Amino acid sequence: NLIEVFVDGQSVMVEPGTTVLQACEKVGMQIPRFCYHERLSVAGNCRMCLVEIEKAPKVVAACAMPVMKGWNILTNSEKSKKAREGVMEFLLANHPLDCPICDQGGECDLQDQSMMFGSDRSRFLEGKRAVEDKNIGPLVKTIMTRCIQCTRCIRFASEIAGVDDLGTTGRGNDMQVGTYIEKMFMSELSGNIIDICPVGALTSKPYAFTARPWETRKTESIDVMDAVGS
Amino acid sequence: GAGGALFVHRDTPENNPDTPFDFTPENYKRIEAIVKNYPEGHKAAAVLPVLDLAQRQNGWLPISAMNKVAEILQVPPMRVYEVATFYTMYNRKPVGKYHIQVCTTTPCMLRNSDSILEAIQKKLGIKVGETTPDKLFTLIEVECLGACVNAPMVQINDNYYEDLTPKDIEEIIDELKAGKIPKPGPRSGRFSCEPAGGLTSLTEPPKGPGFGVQAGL
Amino acid sequence: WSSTADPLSNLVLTFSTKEDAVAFAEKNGWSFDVEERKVPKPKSKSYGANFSWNKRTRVSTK
Amino acid sequence: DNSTYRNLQHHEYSTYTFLDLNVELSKFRMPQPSSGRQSPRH
Amino acid sequence: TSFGSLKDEDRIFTNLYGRHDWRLKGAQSRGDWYKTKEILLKGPDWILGEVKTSGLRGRGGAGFPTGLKWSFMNKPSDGRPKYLVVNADEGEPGTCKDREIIRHDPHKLVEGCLVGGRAMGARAAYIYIRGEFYNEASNLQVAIREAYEAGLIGKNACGSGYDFDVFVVRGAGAYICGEETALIESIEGKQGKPRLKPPFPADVGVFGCPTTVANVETVAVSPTICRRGGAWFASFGRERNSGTKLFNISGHVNHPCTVEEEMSVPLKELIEKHAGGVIGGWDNLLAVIPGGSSTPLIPKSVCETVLMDFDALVQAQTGLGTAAVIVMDRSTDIVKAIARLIEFYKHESCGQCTPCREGVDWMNKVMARFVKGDARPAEIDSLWEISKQIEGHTICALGDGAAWPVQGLIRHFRPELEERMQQFALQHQAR
Amino acid sequence: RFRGEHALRRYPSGEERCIACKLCEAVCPAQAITIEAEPRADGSRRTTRYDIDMTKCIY
Ligand SMILES: Cc1cc2nc3c(=O)[nH]c(=O)nc-3n(C[C@H](O)[C@H](O)[C@H](O)COP(=O)(O)O)c2cc1C
Ligand code: SF4
């Protein structure tokens, strides 16, 4: 049966196996995330979803930690805010200054979560990392200096598209996502990696540089290319 | 400290999917013995031993060898590439006959490990990551090799040469290039991790079976 | 440039309830088409499923 | 006697010593358990 | 009460230094493979109780009750195989005890694997040995072959009706794959990156089956504890810190070595007795790292009166770790040594998770600037803050272990950093 | 600091500075800037249309 957990002191009944992130979603709080996608598996590596339990001295990964009976989740606590600020500091410390020339532009999760949960200043006084750009076909443009190594494309590729040609080569700070060979990621479901990439590492090549998210008007229609009716 | 080695593959005449590589029948027997050390339905667990065997046979790991291993184990070539690039004992680039790996971590750095490295560089006339012109020696720096108490030490084709001095390492290099195989082990007169001055423990004969056996046990 | 002749092109109104929006449209006299809200269904996420002993959910990479 | 190093058998090993020993041990092994499928991709 | 001066009759790891025969005959000359059938007949619960009474704690880093872990794995079967994984990826910079055990007491290791497998109800034992130890792995395989031929392992092991297999898995060079979950991932033929907890390895381990990861020294001392009591093992050491320990003394010491002693021997007596003391004498000692790179450093003041013990070193803002004692004398660059350790952690980082990846690279760069003084005193607190941001926010303990040496250096040698910065500022402003 | 007629600058090499990021268009209070961009022949992110209405600009 349902177990009772507490989010900021508010009681909520959740099924066993529910994670902290899903419990907060039920109570109406959206914990920040970079690697967690509800349609993909759980990775737990970006470390952006760390939250504080009231009596636990260690922060837990909300996207991968199942809730226990009588757990109080402090989403807006000082430890949670400091953890978010530190993780955002690391990500932006290694990220490049490409926002004006980046198609992600005003619809970037790194920008929005930096503005909402991260600090407004940089303590990084060293040199940044530059990564060679790969080529995976005429549809997806890869500028991999902007990759945050969140492994969404790898998990999507394998699980959803049944294609296992994406992965991480090397280790440490020099870990790179790619094919390791000149192989085109050509599939009928290839633009979804453009969608799910939280940063501008993977972007649409036909749409490149044409517009910005705030200018466009959104019209909700359906698809006529096939009989699925997407 | 940048590694200096790329993690991307550019096809070359010497390294391409058409490069000839295939296991010998003895290596196929070894592979079939390795594969059945793991539960059925988990053949992917043999990727590391099979890649190690391929490297031992060939001297290094070409992309064709990686593809052959992937085909043999029915695992994705991308997964094989991930393993090969992650693990540092796999040579994705041709190396010399002898691969000197000098430990340069702090327990060895406290003793004169820089002296050993400098002596090796002077003896061979190469830098810290290059290869001799005759394709005989390659020299690299490595992290802890697990022989800290015998620092400084080097590893040459899975052979530990410990308690080294510049003269000792020069002698080892000369013996290797002559054709002989130097005896691995400490070069300071010690046989093992025991203290150099003398045995401060285990000075008496070991007790036989059933020395302090519990009453019931 | 992009010209227009429709005064109500940029007019978007915000309502807290579908009933409130319907009442406003009815009292103002415009026709209306209502689209029901679509909320994502609950999903069972489990990190331990990535290492299943006999199931296909096992991941080949991390 | 406690003055001679008895671990001298390792100045004979070759490239394939470990794998040859693994091959020899194959006879003494026991049947491995099965997952019911040939691979997670099946 | 005082501790130290362990007797050879009580030393568990006989044949250390390899002065006797390591074969099956040599091990059987000692107490190895004695009444193992009787131990197996006594069975799992008795062995677990014996271990709990002996109070053995983990010898491969974090000190956890081995009895508690094996009791965690003592749950009833649910139709899945059971595995004991013996960790022998001795990548810690300062540790050689596992190498010595494997190379000189392989039959002790095999008997311990069998006893632990019986205690946990495990069908198989995978000994994951690092790839650089080729000769050690070959000796281990020879010992396993001798045991199989003698019938000590296999089907009806020791004539007790318990089937048990022992395999050896040679890894590649990965200090991260030394970690338990990364060890499990590397055995499964993957990259070898640590998992998240839950699920714990006692519930979902290698191949998705219940597995227990145990250290070479722990499993090797298990059968000696079983044959003997465990009141004896508890008698050796303090109340909650019991047994004997292998210490690897290295660095600026007269006689670097590996020795076995009591679990609460004072550090000063250990150094002055089993290693000949510091090269320039005890008054020339500068710092000691008691547990390898993972544990912080302590100055001479702390080292003067401190016991090589878990709780004793915890109260000294340190940790016992792997009992690897690195000694640094007054004539060394402590900043450069810690920077080299941080560079080691940078190279030996799996790169999976953002805090350790980015922060360890950042700390490496900061320390590289520090060793030459090309910095400002306001950056020391920034380095402390980023180290605190790395610690506790990572998947595995490598990220925590990469920040503790930095914290220790900042806490005990901040004047050195500030003086070097002042010297660099004077040198550059003279232009 | 005086603000008068508008101008588009160049780098010392002669390449245009504008990268078609539309921040000026987004921040213009009077909506006097119209920008349309596409990749150049060499793949650069450059503008094709950059109009300013000086009867709508408030300077
Ligand atoms: C040889 C060896 C190397 C280890 N390396 C690491 C490491 O790099 N990082 C880490 O977090 N833990 C490391 N550990 C600790 C393991 O994660 C785990 O705590 C240990 O293997 C369990 O053994 P124990 O119960 O005997 O302590 C290592 C342990 C051993 C034995
Ligand atoms: S991915 Fe996001 S943060 Fe990075 S350059 Fe593009 S817009 Fe900026």
Ligand code: SF4
């Ligand atoms: S390319 Fe994008 S989706 Fe893939 S790991 Fe990098 S940031 Fe994530």
Ligand code: SF4
């Ligand atoms: S802390 Fe470092 S070594 Fe451990 S999982 Fe994270 S990236 Fe890997």
Ligand code: SF4
């Ligand atoms: S679009 Fe506007 S703000 Fe952006 S670079 Fe061009 S002139 Fe500057």
Ligand code: FES
């Ligand atoms: S969202 Fe949980 S660690 Fe990434």
Ligand code: FES
């Ligand atoms: S530090 Fe060099 S062998 Fe360990």
Ligand SMILES: [Mg+2]
């Ligand atoms: Mg995108």
